[PDB]
From a paper:
crystals of the free form of FabC60. these FabC60 molecules is 1.0 Å. atoms of the variable domain, RMSD was 0.4 Å. domain of the light chain (VL) includes residues 1–108. light chains are seen on electron density maps. disordered and are not visible on electron density maps. Tyr34 (L1), Trp93 (L3), and Trp98 (L3). carboxyl group of Ser222 forming hydrogen bonds with Thr33 and His35. the antigen-binding site of the symmetry-related FabC60. residues Tyr50 (H2), Tyr101 (H3), and Trp93 (L3).
C60– STI conjugate for the binding sites of the antibody. All these effects confirm the specific nature of the immune interaction. FabC60 was ~ 80 times lower than that of the full-size antibody. C60 (Kd is about 10-7 M).
Residue numbers in the entry:
A (entry chain A): 1 to 222
B (entry chain B): 1 to 215
The structure:
């Protein structure tokens, strides 16, 4: 059946180029066009352009025409998109989608190829314990945290007590802050459990081969 | 160029019918705009639903139907299901290019609405030793999955050095988000009160600390 398989995520420096691919299957490639679409968070969706591989004819949204090249190899049922002179603005997820005049649109989309444009170097995160500075009065429970600051690239993986403690966990998506990634996780336990029992945040950053196992200790006596 | 506009969010319940609409800034939507609708589900899974105004994509359930309703294009979901909780985008064709609307976030309640649980963490002394301070405001168990976040330092709105995650779905199918305020240690030591305020369904839940007190 109909599938559009996009190439893997790319990391690129400002000023460089990338070229991604979109392998089509489950249909006669020459009977359809290939559309491309950009997505940035809360920027919504932008139409890039399309190619008709049977002729090689292309059409671009004027905004993308200068730095974007759509090509296709009919013989391998694969469409390509080349982004040049990359800036932070080009950090996004890009989709290919099959255009069909009978349908009047794009019925099938690829899974997306993430492009990160960054001058950052590989950096292990700093891991900070987040204890309460104040006891919670109505609180029978307690919420502890772990701040994972200033790493590159993604991902990190975070567990508590080496996986042992997985109930009441919320591990959040990373944000970009001063050109490095930050995330956090919280775990909620009953107040009788901590600090009588140790709770450790275990962070692994495969890129840098670094693991950090930070014990959450309470603040000093008040 | 042309601007395409959709409702920003809609809430429905399993078994009900919902109508999403799509407006062209230039005038009426007509079949010459070949309105498309596409669905976005978590982890950037996009499924085409409708093309050419009313053509249903193969393998899409019949409860999805596209039409014109006077001067707008519309998607009607008859007997909405919990798995229809997703973002819906319309796209209009303008002679030689497609333009997308902003998307509608559809909630299909699989449980009652839930207000957010907010926790504000202060900077660790470990982090302060580096001359940097990060406040962390975690925000869990809210439904529908949309919130806005406002910070205040000594009562005044703070815009700079603030970053917030997009909401994401928890395993209990409510949603979570986190927000960060980043200051220097000197800026942290310079002010006393810090507030993270989360607005959900037009109601505000707030969490505060003073660096002087447990008030």
């Amino acid at each position: 059946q109909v599938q559009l398989q996009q190439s893997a995520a790319e990391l690129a420096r400002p000023g460089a180029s990338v070229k991604m691919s979109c392998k089509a299957s489950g249909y006669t490639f020459t009977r359809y066009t290939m559309h491309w679409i950009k997505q940035r968070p809360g920027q919504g969706l932008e139409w890039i352009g399309y190619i008709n591989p049977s002729s090689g004819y292309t059409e671009y949204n004027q905004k993308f025409r200068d730095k974007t090249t759509l090509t296709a190899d009919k013989s391998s049922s694969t469409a390509y998109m080349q982004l040049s002179s990359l800036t932070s603005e080009d950090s996004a997820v890009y989709y290919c989608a099959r255009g069909d005049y009978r349908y009047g649109g794009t019925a099938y989309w690829g899974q997306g190829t993430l492009v990160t444009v960054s001058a950052a170097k590989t950096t292990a995160p700093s891991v900070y314990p987040l204890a309460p500075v104040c006891g919670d009065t109505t609180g029978s429970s307690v919420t502890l945290g772990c701040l994972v600051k200033g790493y590159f690239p993604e991902p990190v993986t975070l567990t508590w007590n080496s996986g042992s403690l997985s109930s009441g966990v919320h591990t959040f998506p990373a944000v970009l802050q001063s050109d490095l990634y930050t995330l956090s996780s919280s775990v909620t336990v009953t107040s009788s459990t901590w600090p009588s029992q140790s709770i450790t945040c275990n962070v692994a950053h495969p890129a840098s081969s670094t693991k950090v196992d930070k014990k959450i200790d309470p603040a000093g006596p008040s | 160029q042309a601007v395409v506009t959709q409702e920003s969010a809609l809430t429905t319940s399993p078994g009900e019918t919902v109508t999403l609409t799509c407006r062209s800034s230039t005038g009426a939507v007509t079949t010459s705009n070949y309105a498309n609708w596409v669905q976005e589900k978590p982890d950037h899974l996009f499924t085409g639903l409708i093309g050419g105004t009313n053509n249903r994509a193969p393998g899409v359930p019949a409860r999805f139907s596209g039409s014109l309703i006077g001067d707008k294009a519309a998607l009607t979901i008859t007997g909405a299901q919990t798995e229809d909780e997703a973002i819906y985008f319309c796209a209009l064709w303008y002679s030689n290019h497609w333009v997308f609307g902003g998307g509608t976030k559809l909630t299909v309640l699989g449980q009652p609405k839930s207000s957010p649980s907010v926790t504000l963490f202060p900077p660790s002394s470990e982090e302060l030793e580096t001359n940097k301070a990060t406040l962390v405001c975690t925000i869990t168990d809210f439904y529908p999955g949309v919130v806005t976040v406002d910070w205040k330092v000594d009562g005044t709105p703070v815009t700079q050095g603030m970053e917030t995650t997009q909401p994401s779905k928890q395993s209990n199918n409510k949603y979570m988000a986190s927000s960060y305020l980043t200051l220097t240690a000197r800026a942290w030591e310079r002010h006393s009160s810090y507030s993270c305020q989360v607005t959900h369904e037009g109601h505000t839940v707030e969490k505060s600390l003073s660096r002087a007190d447990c008030s």
